[PDB]
Amino acid sequence: TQIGGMSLDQARTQLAPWTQRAAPIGADEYQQRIERARVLMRAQGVDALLIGAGTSLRYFSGVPWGASERLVALLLTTEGDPVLICPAFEEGSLDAVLQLPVRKRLWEEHEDPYALVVQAMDEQHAHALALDPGIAFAVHTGLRAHLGTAIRDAGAIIDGCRMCKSPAELALMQQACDMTLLVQRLAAGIAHEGIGTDQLVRFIDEAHRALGADNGSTFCIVQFGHATAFPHGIPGVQHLRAGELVLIDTGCTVQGYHSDITRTWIYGTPSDAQQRIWELELAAQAAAFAAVRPGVACEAVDQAARAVLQAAGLGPDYRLPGLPHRTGHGCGLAIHEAPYLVRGNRQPLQPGMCASNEPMIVVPGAFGVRLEDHFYVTDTGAQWFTPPSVAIDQPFA
Amino acid sequence: TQIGGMSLDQARTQLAPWTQRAAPIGADEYQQRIERARVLMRAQGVDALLIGAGTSLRYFSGVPWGASERLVALLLTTEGDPVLICPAFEEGSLDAVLQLPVRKRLWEEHEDPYALVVQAMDEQHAHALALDPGIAFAVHTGLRAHLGTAIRDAGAIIDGCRMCKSPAELALMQQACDMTLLVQRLAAGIAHEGIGTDQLVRFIDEAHRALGADNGSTFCIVQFGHATAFPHGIPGVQHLRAGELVLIDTGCTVQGYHSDITRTWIYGTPSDAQQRIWELELAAQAAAFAAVRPGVACEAVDQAARAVLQAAGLGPDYRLPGLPHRTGHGCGLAIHEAPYLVRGNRQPLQPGMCASNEPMIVVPGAFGVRLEDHFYVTDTGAQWFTPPSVAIDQPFA
C-alpha cells in the first residue's frame, strides 16, 4: 500500500506549504558563531581567519552566495571587528543578505582584493593566517602575492564551529527532513509500471517546491534495477519494471540547511537475495545508530555497521558483496561536512553533531540497497531526524 | 508586439526538443586538450599538473562530477600516461563517464589519496607541480603532508587550453545560446500586468527543460523597476507594472557548455531617461564588439565601452550613473572563466576565445539596463553567438 496506488491528485492533496516553520538563524547566533571561531583560533595559535563565499561564509555572516572568481570573504581576527571583503559593485546586494554587522572593505574591478585582506591583517597586527580549506587554491596564490608567512589550514577551526548544531539549526534541518520524507513517501505512492526516472525527478522537485523548500530539490538520484549497484550512479533515463529495486536519494534545504534521505524499495516481487540484502542493510544501519552516544569515536560507528555485514558473510572491510564506502558523513549547511563516519577517524561524537547513517550494501553485478537517515547526537544517545524504513516493501515507518 | 500578448499555449507550441543538436566532444578532442596542456606545461617549466573534479576535469577527461570532500583528480605529467586518482567505490561510476583513457589509482576510504598523487609524481620523476587554481585549498594541505617542493598555480596552463574554443565547443555553446534566446523571447511574450518574477523564473526553467537543456535553467535573475539597479540582485518577489523595466538574465548548458543572455525591456511606456539609458547601453555594447579582433588587449575592449558612456556624460571609470563592473568575462564549461574584459588585463584576444559583452549601466536609486550577448573571436573579427537587441521595446533582432 505504500508502493503504487496513489494518484497525482491524491499526492497533490498532501502538498500544501509547510506550516510548522522553524525560525531563521538570528543575528545573536551569528555573533556566537564568530566568538566560537575566535576561541578556536586562539587555541590553534592563529590570529586571522579567512572565510570564502559558500557554506562557511553563510554560517558566519548569513551571506548565501556561491563562490565565484571574485573574492567575497570574511576576515576574522582574534579581537578585531570582522571585515567583509567584497566587490564594490555588489555592496547593495551584499547589504540585503548580510545578517551580521561587519566592516566592509570594497574593491573595484581592477584592484587587488588580496591586498585588502593583508592590510586588514596589518592594521590588527595579525601574522598567523588560517585559510578556509574549501576556498579555491587561487586565493592562496593571491594571498601569497602579499604575505610571506605560512598560511594554515582552517579546517579544525571551521569544523570546531560547525560540527555541533544549535537548537535552531537542528530545527531547520528537522523541517527539511520532514518535508523530504513526505516527498519520498509521495514518490513511492505515484510509482507505476513504466514510470520514468525523469518523471520521478520532476515530481520530487515539484513536491519540494510546493512544500516550501528554498529551491525545489537540492538534488535527486533515482535508480532502477542494476543501476542501484552504483553508489554514485550512471547517466541515462530508466523505466520501472516489476522485480526491480528502486533507490531514491533526494533532499532539499530550508534556510540552507540540508535534508538528504535515501529509500530503497521493491516494485513487485523481490528475490530471496533482494529480501535478504535489504534486511541486512536495515540491520547494519540500526547497528550504527545503536553505537552512537557522546565520546564514541566516529570510526567505531562505521565499524559497528561493518561488523554486522561481516558476521552475515559480506565484506570483510570494503569487499563486495558488502559496504564499499564509509557508513556516513556530517551534514548541515553543506551536504557533506564533518564529522566523517570512516575508519581512521578518532573524532569523538558530541551533542548536537549531525550525520548520515547509510551503510550501503552493493552486490557486485546485481543491485544495491541504500538506506539513509540522518541522526543527531543527544546528551545520552542519538536522535533520528527521520525514522528508518521497516521492510523491503514498507519504506516508511 | 514582442512584449506581452503571448499565451502559454502559444509559447508551448515553440517548446519541442531542440532538433539541431551539436555533436558531443569526441575522444580525439580530449586527447588534443591533454596534448595542449603538456605543451603549456613545458613552456612554463612545469612537469606535473593536478586537475580537480569540476569544470577542468570535465574539460580534460569528460568526467562531469562536482568537487567534493573526496579527492577526484587527474594528474598529468609531460610524457607519462595521465593518472586518475579516485575513490575505489566510485570506479564503476567513473568508468561510465570517462571519455579519456587513463591509469586509475584507486583509494579506499581510510587511505591517503595525496600519497597516491606524490607516488605517481615520484615514479615519473616529476616534481615541478602545478595545481588547478579552482581546486580546494585543502588539496594544498594534503599534498604538503608529503611534498616540500614548490606547488605552483596552474592558471596559465588551464586558461591557455580552455580560452580558445574548438569548432565543436563553439557549436555546443551556439546550441545553448540559441535555446536560451528562444526562452528569453517567449518569456517576454508571456509577460503581463501583475506577473510575478517567480512565475517568470519557473516558466524559463520549464522552457529550458522542454528544449532539452542539461538541467533546466543554470540560473535565472528576473528584476522589475528599481530592482534592475542591482547588478547581482535582491531577494524578494515582484509583480510587474506598466512603466517598469524588466531585466532577465538566464542560461542553460548543453553538454556542460554555457549560455548566458541578459535582456532589458520596457513593459508599457518608457520615460525619456529609460529610453536614453537603454540606447546608451546598446551603444556601449556595440562599441565593445567593434573593438574585437585578434591581438587586441582585453582591457581595450572594456575601455571601448567605457569611452562611449563617458562621452555621453556617464562615469567616468566606475562612477554611477555608469558602468560599475567589467565589460565582460570568458565563458565555456564555466559561467565565468578567462579571459576577463577588465581594465589592467593585457591578455591579447585570439581566434576561438569566447566572452560576454554586457557593459551594464546603473542609474543609482532608479534602474539599470543590462544587455548581454556573447561573442567569439574569429580570424579577422568577432562573431555574435546571439544578435543584440534592437530597441527598448524590441529585445530581439
mmCIF file of N, CA and C in Angstrom, chain B residues 156-243:
data_model
loop_
_atom_site.group_PDB
_atom_site.id
_atom_site.type_symbol
_atom_site.label_atom_id
_atom_site.label_comp_id
_atom_site.label_asym_id
_atom_site.label_seq_id
_atom_site.Cartn_x
_atom_site.Cartn_y
_atom_site.Cartn_z
ATOM 1 N N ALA B 156 47.690 29.700 -15.755
ATOM 2 C CA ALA B 156 48.137 29.996 -17.124
ATOM 3 C C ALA B 156 48.036 28.771 -17.988
ATOM 4 N N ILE B 157 48.324 27.588 -17.456
ATOM 5 C CA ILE B 157 48.216 26.388 -18.240
ATOM 6 C C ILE B 157 46.759 26.077 -18.574
ATOM 7 N N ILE B 158 45.888 26.094 -17.576
ATOM 8 C CA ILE B 158 44.494 25.761 -17.786
ATOM 9 C C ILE B 158 43.780 26.748 -18.709
ATOM 10 N N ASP B 159 43.979 28.040 -18.442
ATOM 11 C CA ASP B 159 43.415 29.098 -19.316
ATOM 12 C C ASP B 159 43.986 28.937 -20.741
ATOM 13 N N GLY B 160 45.277 28.685 -20.817
ATOM 14 C CA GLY B 160 45.967 28.515 -22.113
ATOM 15 C C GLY B 160 45.303 27.444 -22.965
ATOM 16 N N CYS B 161 44.698 26.454 -22.305
ATOM 17 C CA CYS B 161 43.912 25.446 -23.021
ATOM 18 C C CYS B 161 42.485 25.917 -23.256
ATOM 19 N N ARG B 162 41.804 26.356 -22.188
ATOM 20 C CA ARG B 162 40.357 26.497 -22.285
ATOM 21 C C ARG B 162 39.882 27.763 -22.973
ATOM 22 N N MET B 163 40.741 28.783 -23.064
ATOM 23 C CA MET B 163 40.280 30.105 -23.532
ATOM 24 C C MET B 163 39.806 30.047 -24.965
ATOM 25 N N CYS B 164 40.584 29.372 -25.823
ATOM 26 C CA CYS B 164 40.271 29.224 -27.255
ATOM 27 C C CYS B 164 39.445 27.975 -27.452
ATOM 28 N N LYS B 165 38.202 28.140 -27.909
ATOM 29 C CA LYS B 165 37.307 27.058 -28.082
ATOM 30 C C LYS B 165 37.515 26.403 -29.450
ATOM 31 N N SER B 166 37.326 25.091 -29.535
ATOM 32 C CA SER B 166 37.347 24.373 -30.808
ATOM 33 C C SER B 166 36.014 24.589 -31.536
ATOM 34 N N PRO B 167 35.969 24.236 -32.840
ATOM 35 C CA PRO B 167 34.731 24.301 -33.554
ATOM 36 C C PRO B 167 33.633 23.492 -32.847
ATOM 37 N N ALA B 168 33.961 22.354 -32.243
ATOM 38 C CA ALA B 168 32.875 21.585 -31.610
ATOM 39 C C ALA B 168 32.374 22.252 -30.317
ATOM 40 N N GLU B 169 33.285 22.867 -29.563
ATOM 41 C CA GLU B 169 32.875 23.603 -28.344
ATOM 42 C C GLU B 169 31.972 24.819 -28.696
ATOM 43 N N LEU B 170 32.359 25.536 -29.747
ATOM 44 C CA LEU B 170 31.603 26.678 -30.245
ATOM 45 C C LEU B 170 30.196 26.263 -30.648
ATOM 46 N N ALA B 171 30.063 25.094 -31.284
ATOM 47 C CA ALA B 171 28.756 24.626 -31.694
ATOM 48 C C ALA B 171 27.877 24.205 -30.510
ATOM 49 N N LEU B 172 28.487 23.671 -29.473
ATOM 50 C CA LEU B 172 27.693 23.343 -28.276
ATOM 51 C C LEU B 172 27.235 24.629 -27.559
ATOM 52 N N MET B 173 28.131 25.595 -27.419
ATOM 53 C CA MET B 173 27.730 26.905 -26.908
ATOM 54 C C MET B 173 26.645 27.576 -27.768
ATOM 55 N N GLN B 174 26.803 27.456 -29.081
ATOM 56 C CA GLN B 174 25.853 28.054 -30.017
ATOM 57 C C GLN B 174 24.484 27.448 -29.734
ATOM 58 N N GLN B 175 24.413 26.120 -29.548
ATOM 59 C CA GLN B 175 23.143 25.477 -29.246
ATOM 60 C C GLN B 175 22.483 26.015 -28.014
ATOM 61 N N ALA B 176 23.249 26.107 -26.928
ATOM 62 C CA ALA B 176 22.747 26.597 -25.648
ATOM 63 C C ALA B 176 22.289 28.020 -25.774
ATOM 64 N N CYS B 177 23.071 28.818 -26.492
ATOM 65 C CA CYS B 177 22.683 30.219 -26.791
ATOM 66 C C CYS B 177 21.404 30.326 -27.583
ATOM 67 N N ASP B 178 21.265 29.479 -28.602
ATOM 68 C CA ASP B 178 20.029 29.523 -29.428
ATOM 69 C C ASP B 178 18.831 29.139 -28.594
ATOM 70 N N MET B 179 19.013 28.144 -27.734
ATOM 71 C CA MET B 179 17.911 27.692 -26.917
ATOM 72 C C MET B 179 17.493 28.796 -25.910
ATOM 73 N N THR B 180 18.479 29.389 -25.255
ATOM 74 C CA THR B 180 18.201 30.410 -24.279
ATOM 75 C C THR B 180 17.571 31.659 -24.910
ATOM 76 N N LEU B 181 18.013 32.006 -26.121
ATOM 77 C CA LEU B 181 17.499 33.165 -26.790
ATOM 78 C C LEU B 181 15.997 33.012 -27.053
ATOM 79 N N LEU B 182 15.588 31.812 -27.461
ATOM 80 C CA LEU B 182 14.177 31.481 -27.643
ATOM 81 C C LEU B 182 13.421 31.592 -26.328
ATOM 82 N N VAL B 183 14.005 31.025 -25.277
ATOM 83 C CA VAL B 183 13.356 31.079 -23.973
ATOM 84 C C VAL B 183 13.166 32.542 -23.576
ATOM 85 N N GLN B 184 14.183 33.380 -23.769
ATOM 86 C CA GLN B 184 14.093 34.809 -23.425
ATOM 87 C C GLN B 184 12.973 35.460 -24.197
ATOM 88 N N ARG B 185 12.871 35.139 -25.480
ATOM 89 C CA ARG B 185 11.845 35.669 -26.322
ATOM 90 C C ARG B 185 10.428 35.242 -25.878
ATOM 91 N N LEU B 186 10.287 33.978 -25.515
ATOM 92 C CA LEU B 186 8.992 33.505 -25.017
ATOM 93 C C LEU B 186 8.638 34.176 -23.707
ATOM 94 N N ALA B 187 9.621 34.412 -22.837
ATOM 95 C CA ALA B 187 9.324 34.982 -21.532
ATOM 96 C C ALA B 187 8.808 36.409 -21.686
ATOM 97 N N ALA B 188 9.357 37.145 -22.665
ATOM 98 C CA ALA B 188 8.883 38.488 -22.924
ATOM 99 C C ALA B 188 7.435 38.451 -23.442
ATOM 100 N N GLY B 189 7.162 37.482 -24.283
ATOM 101 C CA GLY B 189 5.872 37.274 -24.859
ATOM 102 C C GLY B 189 4.801 37.017 -23.828
ATOM 103 N N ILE B 190 5.075 36.173 -22.818
ATOM 104 C CA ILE B 190 4.043 35.809 -21.851
ATOM 105 C C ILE B 190 3.871 36.803 -20.742
ATOM 106 N N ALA B 191 4.764 37.756 -20.665
ATOM 107 C CA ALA B 191 4.678 38.700 -19.587
ATOM 108 C C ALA B 191 3.347 39.426 -19.648
ATOM 109 N N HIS B 192 2.829 39.816 -18.508
ATOM 110 C CA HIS B 192 1.620 40.590 -18.460
ATOM 111 C C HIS B 192 1.554 41.317 -17.107
ATOM 112 N N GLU B 193 0.652 42.282 -17.063
ATOM 113 C CA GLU B 193 0.388 43.038 -15.864
ATOM 114 C C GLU B 193 0.220 42.130 -14.649
ATOM 115 N N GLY B 194 0.958 42.399 -13.590
ATOM 116 C CA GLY B 194 0.831 41.616 -12.393
ATOM 117 C C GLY B 194 1.651 40.340 -12.364
ATOM 118 N N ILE B 195 2.307 39.948 -13.463
ATOM 119 C CA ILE B 195 3.064 38.693 -13.459
ATOM 120 C C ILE B 195 4.191 38.771 -12.445
ATOM 121 N N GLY B 196 4.422 37.661 -11.757
ATOM 122 C CA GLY B 196 5.473 37.602 -10.769
ATOM 123 C C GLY B 196 6.831 37.211 -11.369
ATOM 124 N N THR B 197 7.882 37.729 -10.726
ATOM 125 C CA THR B 197 9.252 37.349 -11.036
ATOM 126 C C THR B 197 9.391 35.868 -10.901
ATOM 127 N N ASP B 198 8.750 35.328 -9.850
ATOM 128 C CA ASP B 198 8.818 33.922 -9.580
ATOM 129 C C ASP B 198 8.169 33.120 -10.633
ATOM 130 N N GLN B 199 7.090 33.623 -11.224
ATOM 131 C CA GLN B 199 6.443 32.875 -12.330
ATOM 132 C C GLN B 199 7.303 32.869 -13.579
ATOM 133 N N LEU B 200 7.970 34.002 -13.850
ATOM 134 C CA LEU B 200 8.921 34.064 -14.978
ATOM 135 C C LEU B 200 10.119 33.100 -14.760
ATOM 136 N N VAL B 201 10.682 33.058 -13.548
ATOM 137 C CA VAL B 201 11.715 32.059 -13.215
ATOM 138 C C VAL B 201 11.238 30.619 -13.529
ATOM 139 N N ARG B 202 10.028 30.242 -13.047
ATOM 140 C CA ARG B 202 9.541 28.877 -13.231
ATOM 141 C C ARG B 202 9.390 28.603 -14.703
ATOM 142 N N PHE B 203 8.730 29.521 -15.426
ATOM 143 C CA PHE B 203 8.493 29.326 -16.840
ATOM 144 C C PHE B 203 9.821 29.148 -17.614
ATOM 145 N N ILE B 204 10.791 29.998 -17.330
ATOM 146 C CA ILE B 204 12.044 29.911 -18.021
ATOM 147 C C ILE B 204 12.739 28.537 -17.747
ATOM 148 N N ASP B 205 12.657 28.053 -16.486
ATOM 149 C CA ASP B 205 13.220 26.744 -16.122
ATOM 150 C C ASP B 205 12.522 25.627 -16.884
ATOM 151 N N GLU B 206 11.197 25.648 -16.881
ATOM 152 C CA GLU B 206 10.417 24.648 -17.620
ATOM 153 C C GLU B 206 10.703 24.698 -19.123
ATOM 154 N N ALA B 207 10.834 25.918 -19.672
ATOM 155 C CA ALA B 207 11.080 26.077 -21.110
ATOM 156 C C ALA B 207 12.469 25.530 -21.493
ATOM 157 N N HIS B 208 13.473 25.881 -20.725
ATOM 158 C CA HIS B 208 14.795 25.279 -20.940
ATOM 159 C C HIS B 208 14.742 23.745 -20.856
ATOM 160 N N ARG B 209 14.000 23.202 -19.890
ATOM 161 C CA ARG B 209 13.822 21.706 -19.809
ATOM 162 C C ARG B 209 13.169 21.138 -21.012
ATOM 163 N N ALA B 210 12.094 21.748 -21.429
ATOM 164 C CA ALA B 210 11.435 21.298 -22.672
ATOM 165 C C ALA B 210 12.296 21.295 -23.904
ATOM 166 N N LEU B 211 13.151 22.321 -24.061
ATOM 167 C CA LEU B 211 14.039 22.337 -25.230
ATOM 168 C C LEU B 211 15.166 21.259 -25.157
ATOM 169 N N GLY B 212 15.455 20.718 -23.978
ATOM 170 C CA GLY B 212 16.487 19.666 -23.865
ATOM 171 C C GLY B 212 17.828 20.148 -23.300
ATOM 172 N N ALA B 213 17.794 21.216 -22.500
ATOM 173 C CA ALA B 213 18.956 21.654 -21.733
ATOM 174 C C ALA B 213 19.445 20.486 -20.826
ATOM 175 N N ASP B 214 20.706 20.525 -20.389
ATOM 176 C CA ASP B 214 21.177 19.513 -19.453
ATOM 177 C C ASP B 214 20.323 19.481 -18.178
ATOM 178 N N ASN B 215 20.023 20.656 -17.619
ATOM 179 C CA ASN B 215 19.260 20.689 -16.363
ATOM 180 C C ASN B 215 18.483 21.996 -16.171
ATOM 181 N N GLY B 216 17.490 22.195 -17.006
ATOM 182 C CA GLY B 216 16.671 23.425 -16.933
ATOM 183 C C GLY B 216 17.549 24.654 -17.123
ATOM 184 N N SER B 217 17.206 25.711 -16.399
ATOM 185 C CA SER B 217 17.980 26.901 -16.335
ATOM 186 C C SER B 217 19.169 26.605 -15.418
ATOM 187 N N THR B 218 20.359 27.013 -15.835
ATOM 188 C CA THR B 218 21.504 27.014 -14.945
ATOM 189 C C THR B 218 21.282 27.949 -13.772
ATOM 190 N N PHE B 219 20.642 29.086 -14.059
ATOM 191 C CA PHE B 219 20.360 30.132 -13.107
ATOM 192 C C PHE B 219 19.311 31.030 -13.803
ATOM 193 N N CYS B 220 18.730 31.967 -13.035
ATOM 194 C CA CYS B 220 17.768 32.920 -13.556
ATOM 195 C C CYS B 220 17.585 34.094 -12.594
ATOM 196 N N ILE B 221 17.840 35.300 -13.090
ATOM 197 C CA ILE B 221 17.600 36.505 -12.367
ATOM 198 C C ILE B 221 16.505 37.250 -13.125
ATOM 199 N N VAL B 222 15.452 37.638 -12.441
ATOM 200 C CA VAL B 222 14.425 38.485 -13.061
ATOM 201 C C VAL B 222 14.212 39.666 -12.141
ATOM 202 N N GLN B 223 14.294 40.864 -12.686
ATOM 203 C CA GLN B 223 14.138 42.062 -11.899
ATOM 204 C C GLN B 223 13.202 43.054 -12.591
ATOM 205 N N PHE B 224 12.342 43.707 -11.805
ATOM 206 C CA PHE B 224 11.404 44.765 -12.282
ATOM 207 C C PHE B 224 11.752 46.079 -11.633
ATOM 208 N N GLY B 225 11.672 47.164 -12.411
ATOM 209 C CA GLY B 225 11.621 48.536 -11.802
ATOM 210 C C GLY B 225 12.953 48.862 -11.131
ATOM 211 N N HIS B 226 12.870 49.293 -9.884
ATOM 212 C CA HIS B 226 14.032 49.687 -9.099
ATOM 213 C C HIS B 226 15.076 48.539 -8.854
ATOM 214 N N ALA B 227 14.614 47.291 -8.921
ATOM 215 C CA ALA B 227 15.458 46.145 -8.674
ATOM 216 C C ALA B 227 16.448 45.951 -9.813
ATOM 217 N N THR B 228 16.118 46.449 -11.006
ATOM 218 C CA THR B 228 17.105 46.417 -12.131
ATOM 219 C C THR B 228 18.386 47.196 -11.882
ATOM 220 N N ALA B 229 18.409 48.019 -10.850
ATOM 221 C CA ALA B 229 19.636 48.784 -10.475
ATOM 222 C C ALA B 229 20.701 47.938 -9.733
ATOM 223 N N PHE B 230 20.370 46.694 -9.368
ATOM 224 C CA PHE B 230 21.257 45.835 -8.602
ATOM 225 C C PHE B 230 21.852 44.793 -9.556
ATOM 226 N N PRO B 231 23.115 44.977 -9.958
ATOM 227 C CA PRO B 231 23.715 44.011 -10.879
ATOM 228 C C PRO B 231 23.594 42.596 -10.420
ATOM 229 N N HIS B 232 23.770 42.320 -9.153
ATOM 230 C CA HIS B 232 23.555 40.950 -8.726
ATOM 231 C C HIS B 232 22.154 40.633 -8.139
ATOM 232 N N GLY B 233 21.362 41.630 -7.831
ATOM 233 C CA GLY B 233 20.018 41.321 -7.352
ATOM 234 C C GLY B 233 19.771 41.407 -5.862
ATOM 235 N N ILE B 234 18.522 41.152 -5.515
ATOM 236 C CA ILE B 234 17.966 41.393 -4.207
ATOM 237 C C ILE B 234 16.955 40.257 -3.986
ATOM 238 N N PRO B 235 16.820 39.767 -2.738
ATOM 239 C CA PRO B 235 15.770 38.796 -2.509
ATOM 240 C C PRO B 235 14.413 39.440 -2.715
ATOM 241 N N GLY B 236 13.415 38.621 -2.942
ATOM 242 C CA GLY B 236 12.044 39.119 -2.929
ATOM 243 C C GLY B 236 11.409 38.864 -4.261
ATOM 244 N N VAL B 237 10.087 38.838 -4.262
ATOM 245 C CA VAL B 237 9.311 38.575 -5.427
ATOM 246 C C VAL B 237 8.675 39.882 -5.807
ATOM 247 N N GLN B 238 8.587 40.145 -7.107
ATOM 248 C CA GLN B 238 7.970 41.376 -7.542
ATOM 249 C C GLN B 238 6.894 41.060 -8.547
ATOM 250 N N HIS B 239 6.035 42.037 -8.752
ATOM 251 C CA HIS B 239 4.922 41.906 -9.668
ATOM 252 C C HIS B 239 4.916 43.078 -10.615
ATOM 253 N N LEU B 240 4.708 42.766 -11.906
ATOM 254 C CA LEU B 240 5.001 43.699 -12.979
ATOM 255 C C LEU B 240 3.970 44.822 -13.078
ATOM 256 N N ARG B 241 4.467 46.047 -13.263
ATOM 257 C CA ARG B 241 3.621 47.185 -13.594
ATOM 258 C C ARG B 241 4.137 47.903 -14.830
ATOM 259 N N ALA B 242 3.209 48.522 -15.539
ATOM 260 C CA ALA B 242 3.479 49.315 -16.697
ATOM 261 C C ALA B 242 4.423 50.440 -16.290
ATOM 262 N N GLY B 243 5.359 50.731 -17.178
ATOM 263 C CA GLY B 243 6.406 51.721 -16.882
ATOM 264 C C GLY B 243 7.670 51.145 -16.218
#
